[PDB]
């Protein structure tokens, strides 16, 4: 016979990339948007904006 | 579920104990009206009584298995021949192969087509037999595997088709599609040159709803040496009069001859133009006739797998009306 | 879906009459669960071609058993799955298993059924294999053609003599349909005559065949054209041609003789 | 149906809570530094 | 990246379709994702040929 | 973890590093 | 068995419109359950001929669910014919009770879904009943056939189409033809004593004027007439040609309509339950 | 009139079935009636246009 050596994604190396968190009730939430913007830094440079 | 049909009859063309389940039959025409219909159907030139002898040469049996009939073609791969001869249990089995051969290339001679005698039914799935006297049972609509046969080491079965025969026509044609869900067409080919003439077997799968200008192009050296050695061993008359010619210059002429109805038997009405449509001995639709096909059922896939073969895969049957391609 | 239709209560006898006719066919206007005797019945004798046209404009349905109170029926072209009834046939000849069956007026001697109790009439149209039927209707008009200025059919062993004419109330009742048949066919004929002049003068054995061939592969006649597309069509559509049944008769002979009924399944 | 949208989501580590300084009046004695 | 994609898991869905061949169990499960950080988070090598 | 408008105001895998 | 068709993100604006689409019919290529929207596309107006014709190569599909994520559809007919479903009337016309319905391409290219958020338009066809559409296809081929609510032609496939009419006519001619012609007189003599005579035939019928035009002589003996018969076998012809001429230059009857208790005809842009024949 | 008519109610009867965008219920219910008075016991009455 033949076994099935089955693979765990957490215990990958890959994993550090994203971060995956369960989210139960997307499927009903998806039908609209979320829609979150981040950031974005700014210089204080002289002379009056 | 599905519903059955089922048909008492003669081993003489399928023998269900020969062939395991899952191939599809077909329902023979009682031969009296075809020898009948030849008396008035047969072209001029032509004998107007050879498939009677054909027939009576052969001698109630109705049914005939595909595996059977694609044998008795031209086209076949001969480890069919050799297995419908060496493993089919019945006497003078060959011989009858040959015969039949002898009434079907009789049949497209006197212009009455096999497929005007071949009615299809479903796949066989179930037979009990006396001493050459069986009772077949076949499918007729649903899908195949929806029945219950009592070999109990395969309850359900499939569709089994002779490999030898069975023609694509997408990847043939490479329309760069993509395999779904795929038609399935028997379709025959007629080829009519006066004591050289056959007939082709197939079995045809595509997405293709309307066969036509498919099969006219893929058929095309049919058609074209059908179309001029058709008309053979009929008198066509001389050189074609002049007076053939429609005349066509008279319709809008505003002073032309004219004649009132109700003055037409022999009246000072003789000023007319003669004009004598003169067809006799050109090619009839009839004539032209090469192929003749008629929708089967909706399939998934096909997988070739042993003598070669070919299983289909949720065969559902549904079965049309035959269909014309002469043109 | 089944329909049930009010009888009204005609008599004893001739209700006993009609309780053999459980396998016919009649058509209903609309899909509705309550009917009545008086809108399912045309007349007894009328042209081939209004019952034509009529059978294409209604919905079909079979003949359930009747109780003397109310009949039952089912459509055909709507079912579930579809399911099993059995069909009375009514044909001149019999009708083998694995066949597909048609509806047509009765193009022969027609039958009427005469119920001279509550005074109405019913016709019932006629069963018959696709391809023989596609045959009988050009046999008929074919007779009438040379009365304008032999018929034998064969069927699974023994041959009929398509009764002559005027056996019934008239030929009348076929009349407009030889006369459509014929005056669209000469149409086309001219029509094609006079779009390319010279086809009749072409070689017969070589020209116009190679004609033919090399076309296969790679008052304004135009308005004629476009009226003559559309007689054909709407012709041709109404022509019946379109089996809604196929015979799928399960324990029992192989063969069915006029009269008697048999197991068919919906297309 | 004209779809919208919905609150988005913010980090588990938002710790905005400067208005315990603005909510009334701001000490600015200890307060500072956390924020 | 060390955490580029965010990424939601939502809930498994099964289909049952009654046929002839038995049974088919087209098994589905729907996903979300979102980059976060200002600027790119991830390049190419055309390293070997 | 989803809330509503109320407001405040390891393990040893294997592996090539 | 219901076909998928998955979405990309569109435009909140334009899925309040699409979602009013639950009625018109789709043409796919092939019939995978699984299926992407980019697949099924066309261009806008231009040679109704070109999609006639690619309106039998391909396989219809009612949509009945929209959803932003994905679209059920239907496989309209490929093994069923009781599928009782709901098309909405995106026709010109005003259908009755039992009518069968024809799926016709839409004309002058006004009407389709210009779909920005992703560059790509649907032209949902129009249905009209087989009566009318029979007319429709019938003038359009006499105009494609002239050229060797008022659209141009292409020019490019026109041979095609006057391809298929010359030889669904060409061999309409037999040698039983010339004996039913040899009777045009005899029956243009009948157009006066009765009226329905004259009815039958039509006014400008290209016929009526040849009949007083030329003369024939009686046919000429054929070879073994004195066995076969021949205008059976051209009347057979004949029927088993135009029983199928209406299908070759248009579309076949798809599916018809029928309903209980209301009102009887289902003016445009409406629900009408039709079975599937 | 006061009793014309009479009426039956029966059991609900629910039949479900599954589809791609998930259960689609489908409730029915059987019901029937009988005359009671002997002869007529309702009359139209065109009233006004």
């Given at each position: 016979?033949?076994?099935?050596?089955?693979?765990?994604?957490?215990?990958?190396?890959?994993?550090?990339?994203?971060?995956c968190?369960?989210?139960?009730?997307?499927?009903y939430?998806?039908?609209?948007?979320?829609?979150?913007?981040?950031?974005?830094?700014?210089?204080?440079?002289?002379?009056?904006? | 579920?599905?519903?059955?049909?089922?048909?008492?009859?003669?081993?003489?063309?399928?023998?269900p104990?020969?062939?395991?389940?899952?191939?599809?039959?077909?329902?023979?025409?009682?031969?009296?009206?075809?020898?009948?219909?030849?008396?008035?159907?047969?072209?001029?030139?032509?004998?107007?009584?050879?498939?009677?002898?054909?027939?009576?040469?052969?001698?109630?049996?109705?049914?005939?298995?595909?595996?059977?009939?694609?044998?008795?073609?031209?086209?076949?791969?001969?480890?069919?021949?050799?297995?419908?001869?060496?493993?089919?249990?019945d006497?003078?089995?060959?011989?009858?192969?040959?015969?039949?051969?002898?009434?079907?290339?009789?049949?497209?001679?006197?212009?009455?087509?096999?497929?005007?005698?071949?009615?299809?039914?479903?796949?066989?799935?179930?037979?009990?037999?006396?001493?050459?006297?069986?009772?077949?049972?076949?499918?007729?609509?649903?899908?195949?595997?929806?029945?219950?046969?009592?070999?109990?080491?395969?309850?359900?079965s499939?569709?089994?088709?002779?490999?030898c025969?069975?023609?694509?026509?997408?990847?043939?044609?490479?329309?760069?599609?993509?395999?779904?869900?795929?038609?399935?067409?028997?379709?025959?080919?007629?080829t009519?040159?006066?004591?050289?003439?056959?007939?082709?077997?197939?079995?045809?799968?595509?997405?293709?709803?309307?066969?036509?200008?498919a099969?006219?192009?893929?058929?095309?050296?049919?058609?074209?040496?059908?179309?001029?050695?058709?008309?053979?061993?009929?008198?066509?008359p001389?050189?074609?009069?002049?007076?053939?010619?429609?005349?066509?210059?008279?319709?809008?002429?505003?002073?032309?001859?004219?004649?009132?109805?109700?003055?037409?038997?022999?009246?000072?009405?003789?000023?007319?133009?003669?004009?004598?449509?003169?067809?006799?001995?050109?090619?009839?639709?009839?004539?032209?006739?090469?192929?003749?096909?008629?929708?089967?059922?909706?399939?998934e896939?096909v997988?070739?797998?042993?003598?070669?073969?070919?299983?289909?895969?949720?065969?559902?049957?549904?079965?049309?009306?035959?269909?014309?391609?002469?043109? | 879906?089944?329909?049930?239709?009010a009888?009204?209560?005609?008599?004893?006898?001739?209700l006993?009459?009609?309780?053999?006719?459980?396998?016919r066919?009649?058509?209903?206007?609309?899909?509705?669960?309550?009917?009545?005797?008086?809108?399912?019945?045309l007349?007894?004798?009328?042209?081939?071609?209004?019952?034509?046209?009529?059978?294409?404009?209604?919905?079909?349905?079979?003949?359930?058993?009747?109780?003397?109170?109310?009949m039952?029926?089912?459509?055909?072209?709507?079912?579930?799955?579809?399911?099993?009834?059995?069909?009375?046939?009514?044909?001149?000849?019999?009708?083998?298993?694995?066949?597909?069956?048609?509806?047509?007026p009765?193009?022969?001697?027609?039958?009427?059924?005469?119920?001279?109790s509550?005074?109405?009439?019913?016709?019932?149209?006629?069963?018959?294999?696709?391809?023989?039927?596609?045959?009988?209707?050009?046999?008929?008009?074919?007779?009438?053609?040379?009365?304008?200025?032999?018929?034998?059919?064969?069927?699974?062993?023994?041959?009929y003599?398509?009764?002559?004419?005027?056996?019934?109330?008239?030929?009348?009742?076929?009349?407009?349909?030889?006369?459509?048949?014929?005056?669209?066919?000469?149409?086309?004929?001219?029509?094609?005559?006079?779009?390319?002049?010279?086809?009749?003068?072409?070689?017969?054995?070589?020209?116009?065949?190679?004609?033919?061939?090399?076309?296969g592969?790679?008052?304004?006649?135009?308005?004629?054209?476009?009226a003559?597309?559309?007689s054909?069509?709407?012709?041709?559509?109404?022509?019946?041609?379109?089996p809604?049944?196929?015979?799928?008769?399960?324990?029992?002979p192989?063969?069915?003789?006029?009269?008697?009924?048999?197991?068919?399944?919906?297309? | 149906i004209?779809?919208?949208?919905?609150?988005?989501?913010?980090?588990?580590?938002?710790?905005?809570?400067?208005?315990?300084?603005?909510?009334?009046?701001?000490?600015?004695?200890?307060?500072?530094?956390?924020? | 990246?060390?955490?580029?994609?965010?990424?939601?898991?939502?809930?498994?869905?099964?289909?049952?379709?009654?046929?002839?061949?038995?049974?088919?169990?087209?098994?589905?499960?729907?996903?979300?994702?979102?980059?976060?950080?200002?600027?790119?988070?991830?390049?190419?090598?055309?390293?070997?040929? | 973890?989803?809330?509503?408008?109320?407001?405040?105001?390891?393990?040893?895998?294997?592996?090539?590093?």
């Amino acid at each position: 016979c033949s076994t099935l050596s089955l693979v765990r994604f957490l215990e990958l190396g890959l994993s550090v990339a994203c971060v995956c968190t369960k989210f139960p009730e997307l499927s009903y939430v998806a039908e609209g948007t979320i829609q979150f913007e981040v950031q974005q830094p700014m210089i204080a440079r002289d002379g009056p904006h | 579920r599905a519903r059955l049909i089922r048909q008492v009859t003669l081993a003489d063309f399928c023998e269900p104990q020969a062939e395991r389940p899952g191939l599809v039959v077909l329902a023979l025409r009682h031969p009296a009206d075809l020898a009948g219909a030849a008396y008035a159907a047969t072209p001029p030139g032509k004998n107007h009584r050879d498939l009677e002898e054909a027939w009576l040469a052969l001698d109630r049996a109705s049914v005939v298995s595909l595996n059977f009939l694609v044998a008795a073609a031209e086209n076949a791969d001969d480890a069919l021949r050799a297995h419908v001869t060496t493993n089919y249990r019945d006497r003078r089995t060959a011989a009858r192969l040959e015969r039949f051969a002898t009434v079907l290339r009789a049949m497209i001679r006197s212009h009455v087509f096999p497929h005007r005698a071949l009615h299809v039914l479903g796949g066989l799935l179930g037979h009990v037999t006396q001493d050459r006297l069986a009772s077949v049972t076949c499918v007729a609509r649903g899908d195949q595997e929806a029945a219950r046969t009592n070999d109990m080491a395969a309850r359900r079965s499939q569709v089994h088709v002779p490999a030898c025969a069975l023609m694509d026509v997408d990847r043939e044609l490479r329309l760069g599609g993509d395999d779904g869900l795929r038609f399935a067409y028997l379709v025959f080919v007629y080829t009519q040159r006066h004591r050289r003439e056959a007939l082709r077997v197939h079995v045809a799968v595509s997405r293709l709803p309307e066969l036509g200008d498919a099969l006219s192009f893929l058929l095309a050296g049919t058609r074209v040496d059908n179309a001029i050695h058709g008309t053979d061993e009929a008198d066509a008359p001389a050189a074609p009069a002049a007076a053939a010619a429609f005349p066509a210059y008279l319709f809008n002429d505003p002073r032309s001859a004219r004649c009132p109805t109700g003055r037409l038997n022999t009246p000072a009405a003789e000023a007319l133009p003669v004009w004598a449509p003169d067809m006799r001995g050109r090619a009839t639709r009839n004539s032209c006739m090469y192929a003749a096909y008629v929708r089967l059922g909706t399939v998934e896939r096909v997988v070739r797998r042993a003598l070669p073969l070919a299983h289909m895969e949720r065969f559902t049957w549904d079965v049309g009306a035959w269909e014309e391609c002469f043109f | 879906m089944e329909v049930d239709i009010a009888l009204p209560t005609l008599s004893p006898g001739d209700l006993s009459a009609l309780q053999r006719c459980e396998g016919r066919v009649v058509f209903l206007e609309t899909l509705r669960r309550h009917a009545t005797l008086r809108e399912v019945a045309l007349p007894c004798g009328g042209d081939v071609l209004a019952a034509m046209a009529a059978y294409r404009r209604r919905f079909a349905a079979v003949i359930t058993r009747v109780t003397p109170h109310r009949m039952l029926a089912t459509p055909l072209g709507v079912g579930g799955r579809g399911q099993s009834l059995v069909l009375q046939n009514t044909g001149p000849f019999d009708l083998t298993n694995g066949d597909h069956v048609c509806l047509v007026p009765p193009l022969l001697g027609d039958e009427c059924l005469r119920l001279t109790s509550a005074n109405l009439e019913l016709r019932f149209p006629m069963t018959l294999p696709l391809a023989q039927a596609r045959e009988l209707t050009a046999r008929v008009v074919a007779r009438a053609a040379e009365t304008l200025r032999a018929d034998v059919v064969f069927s699974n062993g023994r041959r009929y003599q398509l009764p002559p004419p005027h056996r019934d109330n008239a030929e009348a009742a076929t009349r407009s349909l030889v006369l459509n048949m014929i005056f669209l066919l000469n149409e086309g004929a001219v029509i094609l005559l006079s779009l390319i002049p010279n086809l009749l003068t072409l070689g017969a054995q070589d020209g116009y065949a190679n004609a033919v061939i090399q076309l296969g592969s790679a008052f304004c006649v135009f308005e004629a054209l476009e009226a003559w597309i559309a007689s054909a069509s709407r012709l041709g559509d109404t022509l019946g041609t379109r089996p809604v049944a196929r015979v799928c008769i399960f324990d029992g002979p192989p063969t069915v003789p006029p009269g008697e009924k048999a197991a068919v399944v919906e297309v | 149906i004209e779809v919208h949208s919905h609150r988005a989501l913010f980090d588990i580590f938002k710790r905005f809570r400067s208005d315990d300084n603005n909510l009334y009046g701001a000490e600015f004695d200890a307060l500072l530094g956390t924020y | 990246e060390k955490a580029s994609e965010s990424y939601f898991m939502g809930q498994m869905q099964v289909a049952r379709t009654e046929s002839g061949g038995g049974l088919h169990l087209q098994l589905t499960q729907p996903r979300a994702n979102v980059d976060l950080g200002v600027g790119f988070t991830a390049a190419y090598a055309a390293a070997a040929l | 973890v989803i809330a509503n408008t109320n407001l405040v105001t390891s393990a040893r895998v294997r592996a090539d590093l």
